[PDB]
Amino acid sequence: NKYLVEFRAGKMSLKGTTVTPDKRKGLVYIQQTDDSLIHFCWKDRTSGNVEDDLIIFPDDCEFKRVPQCPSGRVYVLKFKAGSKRLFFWMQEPKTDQDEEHCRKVNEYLNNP
Amino acid sequence: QEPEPPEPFEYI
């Protein structure tokens, strides 16, 4: 099932006010299934297990850069339905495409 | 190669 956008990222944890990261080589991507729904998933590049698979409709989410993280390229998939924040730190070698991937995420989530 | 994890940061 072809992907629509993919890029190496890892995960992080939001304890209280404190976003803590995860060490695994993960990957973020967006996939369209045969019934057309748009999924936002994250899978373990190591084991290959897909730990996250969310069906996303226009206006569900924003995928944004996180300013409070200087030491990493932290992005947050955030929901208007509540306090579901989902944190990811870019694991790509070159930062050249961080911002294109951020745009294309938002684009496919909200313009499918 | 591949970046190092970020240091924990407060979320605001």
């Binding site: 969310l54 996303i56 989410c61 339905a81 | -």
Partner: protein, 72 residues
């Protein structure tokens, strides 16, 4: 409490429910309103598909929430 179910074609309906209610108890309410067999109903919220047997609290769905109703 008051919640809304919106379909893709745009048709909205308003339901009165409890957080204790099970997803199947919600698809029954939708059927009574629109006539759609629950077997044809998919309800998605915050990117999670709501499963039969779990409740609305399990997904911590609160008053004035909009559930996505996709048909199969």
């Amino acid at each position: 409490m008051q919640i809304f179910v919106k379909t893709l074609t745009g048709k909205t309906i308003t339901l009165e429910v409890e957080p204790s209610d099970t997803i199947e108890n919600v698809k029954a309410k939708i059927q009574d309103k629109e006539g759609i067999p629950p077997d044809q109903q998919r309800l998605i919220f915050a990117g999670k598909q709501l499963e039969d047997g779990r409740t609305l609290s399990d997904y911590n769905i609160q008053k004035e929430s909009t559930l996505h109703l996709v048909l199969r």
